[PDB]
Amino acid sequence: RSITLGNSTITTQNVVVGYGVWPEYLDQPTQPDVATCRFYTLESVQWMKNSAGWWWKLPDALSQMGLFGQNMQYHYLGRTGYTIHVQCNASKFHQGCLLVVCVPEAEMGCSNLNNTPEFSELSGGDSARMFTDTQVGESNAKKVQTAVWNAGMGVGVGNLTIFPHQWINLRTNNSATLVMPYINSVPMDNMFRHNNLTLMIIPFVPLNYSEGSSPYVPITVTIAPMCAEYNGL
Amino acid sequence: GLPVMTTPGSTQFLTSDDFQSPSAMPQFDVTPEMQIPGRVNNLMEIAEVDSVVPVNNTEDNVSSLKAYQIPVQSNSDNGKQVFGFPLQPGANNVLNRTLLGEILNYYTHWSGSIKLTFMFCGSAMATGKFLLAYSPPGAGVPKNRKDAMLGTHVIWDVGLQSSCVLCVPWISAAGYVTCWYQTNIVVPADVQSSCDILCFVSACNDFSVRMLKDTPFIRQDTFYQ
Amino acid sequence: GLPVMTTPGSTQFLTSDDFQSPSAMPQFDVTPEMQIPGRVNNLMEIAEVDSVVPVNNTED
Amino acid sequence: GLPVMTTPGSTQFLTSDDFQSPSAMPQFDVTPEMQIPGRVNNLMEIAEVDSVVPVNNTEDNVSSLKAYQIPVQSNSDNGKQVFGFPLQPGANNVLNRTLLGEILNYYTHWSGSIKLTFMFCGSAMATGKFLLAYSPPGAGVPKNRKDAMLGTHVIWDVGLQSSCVLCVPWISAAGYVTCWYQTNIVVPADVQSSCDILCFVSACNDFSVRMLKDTPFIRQDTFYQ
Amino acid sequence: DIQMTQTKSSLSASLGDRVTISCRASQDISNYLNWYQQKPDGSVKLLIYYTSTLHSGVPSRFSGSGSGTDYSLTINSLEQEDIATYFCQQGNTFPFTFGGGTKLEIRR
Amino acid sequence: SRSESSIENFLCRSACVYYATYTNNSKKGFAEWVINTRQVAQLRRKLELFTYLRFDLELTFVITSAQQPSTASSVDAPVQTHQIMYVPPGGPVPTKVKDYAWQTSTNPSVFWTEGNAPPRMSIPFISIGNAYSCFYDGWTVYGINTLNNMGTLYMRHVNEAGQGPIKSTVRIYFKPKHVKAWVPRPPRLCQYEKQKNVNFSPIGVTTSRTDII
Amino acid sequence: SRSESSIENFLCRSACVYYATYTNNSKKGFAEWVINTRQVAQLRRKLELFTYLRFDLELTFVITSAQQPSTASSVDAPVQTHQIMYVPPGGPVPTKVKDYAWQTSTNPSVFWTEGNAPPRMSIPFISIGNAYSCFYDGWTVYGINTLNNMGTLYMRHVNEAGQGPIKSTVRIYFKPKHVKAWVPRPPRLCQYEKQKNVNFSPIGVTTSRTDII
Amino acid sequence: VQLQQSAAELARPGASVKMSCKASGYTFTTYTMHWVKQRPGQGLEWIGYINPSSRYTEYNQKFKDKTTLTADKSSSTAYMQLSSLTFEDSAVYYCARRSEADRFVYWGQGTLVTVSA
Amino acid sequence: VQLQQSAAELARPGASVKMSCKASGYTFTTYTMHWVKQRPGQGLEWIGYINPSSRYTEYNQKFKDKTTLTADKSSSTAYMQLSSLTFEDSAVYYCARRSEADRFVYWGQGTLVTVSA
DSSP characters for G8-36? Answer: HHHH---EEEEEEEEESSSSS--EEEE--
CB-based contact A230:A30 (threshold 8 Å): yes
The count of residues in chain D is 225
Q: How many CB atoms lie within 10 A of CB D78?
A: 9
Q: How close, in Å, is residue D178 to chain B by CA atoms?
A: 35
DSSP state, residue B66: G
Query: What's the order of all strands across the beta sheet hosting E19-24?
Result: E19-24, E70-75, E62-67
Nearest Cα to G55, choosing from G178, G184, G182, G181? Answer: G178
Neighbouring CB atoms inside 10 A of H53's CB total 23
Torsion of CA G189, G195, G199, G204, to 10 degrees: -20
Instruction: Say if residues A9 and A85 touch (Cβ distance below 8 Å).
Output: no
Q: Name the maximum alpha-carbon separation found in chain D.
A: 100
Q: How far apart are CA D99 and CA D116, in angstroms?
A: 13
> Do A22 and A189 contact (CB within 8 A), yes or no?
no
Q: Distance from A153 to chain H by nearest Cα, in Å?
A: 17
DSSP H or E segment with residue B47: helix B44-47
In angstroms, this model's resolution equals 3.2
Q: Which of I53, B170, C41 is nearest to G208 (CA)?
A: I53
Dihedral of CA atoms G189, G192, G193, G195 in degrees, nearest 10, equals: 140
B80-118 burial, b at 16+ Cβ within 10 Å, e below that, comes to ebbbbbbbebeeebbbbbbbbbbbbbbbeebebebbbbb
3-state helix, strand, coil in chain G (%, to 5): 5, 35, 60
Pair E80, E15: CB distance under 8 Å: yes
The correct CATH number of E10-105 out of 3.40.50.1820, 3.40.50.300, 2.60.40.10, 3.90.110.10 is 2.60.40.10
Instruction: Give the whole-angstrom CA distance, residue A113 versus residue A119.
Output: 17
CA dist H25 to H3, H4, H95, H106, Å?
A: 9, 11, 15, 11
SS3 per-residue string spanning chain C = CCCEEECCCCCCCCCCCCCCCCCCCCCCCCCCCCCCCCCCCCCHHHHCCCCCCCCCCCCC
Q: Backbone phi, then psi, for B77, in 5-degree steps?
A: -90, 155
Label the pairing between strands E103-105 and E10-12. Answer: parallel
Inter-chain residue contact D206 with G2, CB threshold 8 Å: yes
Residue D80 CA to residue D85 CA, distance in Å, equals: 15
Angle at H14 between CA H13 and CA H16, to 5 degrees: 100
- Number of compact structural domains in chain H: 1
Q: Which chain B residue has the Cα nearest residue F60?
A: B13
Among H29, H32, H100, beta carbon nearest to F204: H29
Chains that touch F (3 or more CB pairs under 8 A): A, B, C, D, G, H
**For residue I88, with 0-12 CB atoms within 10 Å meaning exposed, 13-18 middle and 19 or more buried, which class applies?**
exposed
Q: How far apart are the first and last CA of chain D?
A: 53
CB G106 within 8 A of CB G87: no
The strand pair at D179-186 and D81-83 is best described as antiparallel
F160 contacts in G (CB within 8 Å)?
64, 66, 169
Q: CA-CA distances (angstroms) from residue A35 to A8, A228, A229, G136?
A: 12, 10, 11, 66
Q: Is the distance from CB of A161 to CB of A101 less than 8 angstroms?
A: yes
Taking alpha carbons only, the member of D116, D53, D90 closest to residue D171 is: D90
Q: Which of H52, H45, H50 is nearest to H26 (CA)?
A: H52
CA dist list (Å): B38 to A18, A154, A200, D31, F125: 9, 23, 20, 60, 21
| Amino acid sitting at position A58 | L
Within chain B, how many helices (H) and strands (E) appear? 2, 13
Other Cβ atoms less than 10 A from the Cβ of G42: the count is: 17
Inform me whether the C-beta atom of residue A71 falls under 8 Å from chain D C-beta atoms. Answer: no
Chain D residues touching residue A192 (CB < 8 angstroms): none
Residue I36: what are its φ and ψ, rounded to 5°?
-125, 135
Per the DSSP assignment, residues forming a β-bridge with B139 are B137
Query: What 3-state DSSP class applies to I117?
Result: coil
Put simply, the answer to whether B16 touches C10 (Cβ < 8 Å) is: no
Q: CB–CB of B13/C18 below 8 Å? A: no
Residue I110's region, left for phi above 0, alpha for psi from -120 to 50, else beta, is left
Q: How was this structure determined?
A: cryo-EM
Give domain limits for chain D. 1-224
If we measure between CA atoms, which residue out of A219, A214, A206, A212 comes closest to residue A46? A219
User: How far is the CA of B27 from the CAs of D7, D17, D212, G7, in angstroms?
Assistant: 24, 11, 10, 12
The DSSP bridge pattern shows strands H111-115 and H9-11 to be: parallel
Closest CA to G42 of I45, D7, F106, F200: F106
What are the CA-CA distances from residue A137 to residues A143, A145, C4, E1, H26 (Å)?
A: 9, 9, 70, 17, 25
Query: Helix, strand or coil for residue G7?
Result: helix
Where b means 16+ CB within 10 Å and e means fewer, A6-25 reads eeeebeeeeeeebbebebee
Residues of D195-207 as b/e, b for ≥16 C-beta within 10 angstroms? bbbbbbbbbbeeb
Convert chain A into a string of H (helix), E (strand) and C (coil).
Answer: CCEEECCEEECCCCCEECCCCCCCCCCCEECCCCCCCCCEECCCEEECCCCCCEEEEHHHHCCCCCCHHHHHHHCCCCEEEEEEEEEECCCCCCECEEEEEEECCCCCCECCCCCCCCHHHHCECCECEECECCCCCCCCCCCECCECCCCCCCECHHHHHHCCEEEEECCCCCEEEEEECCCCCCCCCCCCCECCCEEEEEECCCCECCECECCCEEEEEEEEEEEEEEECC
**Residue C22 Rama label (left phi>0; alpha psi -120 to 50; beta):** beta
CB contacts of G121 in chain D (<8 Å) are: 21-24
Name residue I88's amino acid.
E
Subunits in contact with chain E (3 or more CB pairs closer than 8 Å)? A, B, H
Beta strands of chain I (E only): which ranges?
Answer: 3-5, 9-11, 17-19, 21-23, 33-38, 44-51, 56-59, 67-72, 77-82, 91-99, 103-107, 111-115
Give bridge partners of residue D157 from the DSSP assignment.
Answer: D129
Q: Which DSSP symbol is given to B65? A: G
The conformational region for residue F210 under phi > 0 = left, psi -120 to 50 = alpha, else beta, is: alpha
Please spell the DSSP secondary structure of F23-70, one letter per residue: ESSSSS--EEEE--S-SSHHHHHHHTTEEEEEEEEEEEEEEEEEE---
For residue F189, the number of C-alpha atoms closer than 13 Å in the C-beta half-sphere is 28
How far is H53 from chain B, CA to nearest CA, in Å?
7
Whether B218 and F192 lie within 8 Å, measured CB to CB: yes
- In chain A, the residue whose alpha carbon lies closest to the alpha carbon of E90 is A114
Q: How many CB atoms sit inside 10 A of residue B159's CB?
A: 13
CA-based torsion, F27, F28, F31, F34: positive or negative? positive
Pick among 2.60.120.20, 3.30.56.10, 1.20.120.420, 3.30.70.270: CATH of A1-233: 2.60.120.20
CA distance D43 to H54: 65
- B175 closest CA partner among B114, B223, B109: B114
F91 touches chain D (CB under 8 A): yes
CA distances from residue A192 to A85, A126, A134 in whole angstroms, order as listed: 24, 15, 31
Give the dihedral of Cα atoms F86, F90, F96, F99; nearest 10 deg: -80
Q: What is the full DSSP assignment across chain D?
A: -EEE-PPSS-S-EETT------BSS-S--PPPP---S-EESBTHHHHTS-EE-----TTTSTTSGGGSPEEE---S-SS-EEE--B--SSSS-TTSSSTTTTTTTSEEE-EEEEEEEEEEES-SS-EEEEEE-BBPBTBPPPSSHHHHHSSB--EEETTT-SEEEEEEEEE----B--EEEEEEEE--TTS---EEEEEEE--SS----EEE---TT---SS---
Q: How would you write G128-150 as a 3-class SS string?
A: CCCCEECCCCCECCECCCCCCCC
CA distance B61 to chain E (A): 29
Between CA D32 and CA G180 the distance in angstroms is 13
Maximum CA pair distance of chain B?
100
Report the C-alpha gap between H79 and F125 in whole angstroms: 53
- Strand bridging mode I91-99 / I111-115: antiparallel
Helix (H, G, I), strand (E, B) or coil at E82: helix
Q: The domain that contains H28 carries what CATH number?
A: 2.60.40.10
3 state SS of I88: helix
Extents of the domains making up chain A? 1-233
- The three-class DSSP label of residue F114 is coil
The DSSP annotation for chain H comes to --EEE---EEE-TT--EEE-EEE-SS-TTTS-EEEEEE-TTS-EEEEEEEETTTTEEEE-STTTTTEEEEEETTTTEEEEEE-S--GGG-EEEEEEEEETTTEEEEE---EEEEE--
Distance between CA F208 and CA G98 in Å, rounded? Answer: 85
CA distances (Å), B87 to each of A121, B50, B84, in order? Answer: 43, 17, 10
Residues 6+ apart with CB under 8 A from F127: B31, F147, F148, F149
Residue E55 β-bridge partners:
none
Residue F104 is which amino acid? T
Q: What one-character DSSP code corresponds to residue F11?
A: H
Q: How far apart are CA H13 and CA C53, in angstroms?
A: 96
Contact A139, H61 (CB under 8 A): no
Of I53, I100, I105, Cβ closest to residue D224: I100
Cα–Cα distance, D2 to D137 (Å, whole number) = 65
Min Cα separation F120/chain H (Å)? 32
Long-range pairs for C13-19 at CB < 8 Å and ≥24 separation? C13/B8, C17/B7, C19/B7, C19/B8, C19/D3
Name the β-bridge partners of I22. Answer: I4
For chain I, list the contacting chains (3+ Cβ pairs, <8 Å): D, G
CA distance D128 to D187: 9
Q: How far apart are CA A149 and CA D145, in angstroms?
A: 58
- Residue F102 main-chain phi, psi, to 5 deg: -80, -30
D24 vs D21: CA distance, rounded Å: 9
Named by the residue before each, gaps in chain F exceeding 2.5 A from C to N are 140
- Between the CA of residue D4 and those of C12, F121, G90, what are the distances in Å? 13, 21, 44
Whether D15 has its CB under 8 Å from any CB of chain F: the answer is: yes
Contact criterion met (CB below 8 Å) for A189 and A196 = yes
3-state class of G47 per DSSP?
helix
Distance from CA of D93 to the nearest CA of F (A): 20
Determine the residue of chain A that is closest to F145 in CA distance: A194
Decide if A111 contacts A86 (C-beta within 8 A). no
